[PDB]
Design a protein around this nucleic acid. Structure first.
Lengths: 50, 50, 153
DNA sequence: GTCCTATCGATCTTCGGAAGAGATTCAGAG
DNA sequence: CTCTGAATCTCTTCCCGCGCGCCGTAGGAC
């Protein structure tokens, strides 16, 4: 009654969240310093961390 | 009995002691001790009960 | 009076450190707290240290560490980072304002298809600002001429 | 694309070890 | 005022072989 079972759909979700946290960390700074005019959402993010 | 062992006085004292014991080598500051305490257990980025 | 302070910075990201400080000064409108930020460079004096003209306020102490790729300043204690000196700034600004291939020497090349090969000086192309170094090609180790930029001493 | 330099020089590295031994501090203790 | 108590700190340690099997520098500048 105190131990619960994590499965693939939760561990994978957590790993995806970690990747998205890294991506947010990068792109918050990019948007703070970016000119926001020529930028497009593809420029904001890169798939590599996720 | 905890009161008798407490060396701190008030909220400023609490934040100073928490900052010092949490981060050795880091100076306390009123505007920053909040940034540490709230992130500890009240900020979504670093606390989330499922 | 804004004394200079030295800050640790990611080597290779040092220019981005200076720029990220420059943006953050204006964004936090602390323009009245920062005079200049120096990254001296020659054709880099300080490999991985950023000099910032600054005053000492706790807001500025946290502002600099709020710039990316910045651990913090170098000083006696973390509570109070220290400036450099009176004459140290002047010396750094002074510098910021202000070899012969001996025959027979064994060299290595710097660029080209023959880059980094065991050659040996064979003659002197001196007044050409050039070079000629013997190397071991197809048994007919050929008399091979190089640019002066192709030395490795 | 190649080749480079550098290595949380703005995080948080895990919380489900136990013990056993020293070594290092403290605390009434005269 | 330190001394000679505990108490609270960090460090060291944890059976033998044997097989599979994967998995194994990174981001940035010319």
């Amino acid at each position: 009654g105190n131990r619960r079972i994590r499965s693939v759909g939760e561990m994978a979700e957590n790993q995806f969240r970690v990747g998205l946290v890294r991506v947010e960390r990068a792109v918050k700074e990019r948007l703070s310093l970016g000119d926001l005019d020529t930028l497009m959402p593809q420029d904001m993010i890169n798939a590599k961390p996720i | 009995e905890t009161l008798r062992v407490d060396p701190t006085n008030d909220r400023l004292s609490a934040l100073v002691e928490i900052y010092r014991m949490m981060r050795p080598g880091e100076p306390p500051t009123r505007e920053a001790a909040e940034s540490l305490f709230e992130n500890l257990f009240f900020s979504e980025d670093r606390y989330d009960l499922s | 009076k804004k004394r200079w302070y030295v800050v640790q910075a990611f080597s290779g990201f040092e220019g981005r450190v200076a720029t990220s400080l420059r943006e953050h000064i204006k964004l936090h409108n602390m323009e009245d707290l920062f005079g200049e930020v120096m990254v001296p460079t020659e054709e880099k004096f300080f490999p991985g240290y950023v000099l910032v003209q600054m005053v000492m306020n706790d807001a500025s102490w946290h502002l600099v560490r709020s710039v990316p790729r910045v651990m913090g300043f170098i000083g006696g204690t973390s509570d109070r980072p220290a400036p450099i000196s009176d004459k140290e700034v002047d010396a750094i600004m002074n510098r910021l304002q202000q070899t012969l291939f001996e025959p027979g020497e064994m060299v290595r090349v710097n660029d080209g298809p023959f880059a980094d090969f065991n050659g040996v000086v064979e003659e002197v192309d001196y007044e050409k600002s050039r070079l000629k170094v013997s190397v071991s090609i197809f048994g007919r180790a050929t008399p091979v001429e190089l640019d002066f930029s192709q030395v490795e001493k």
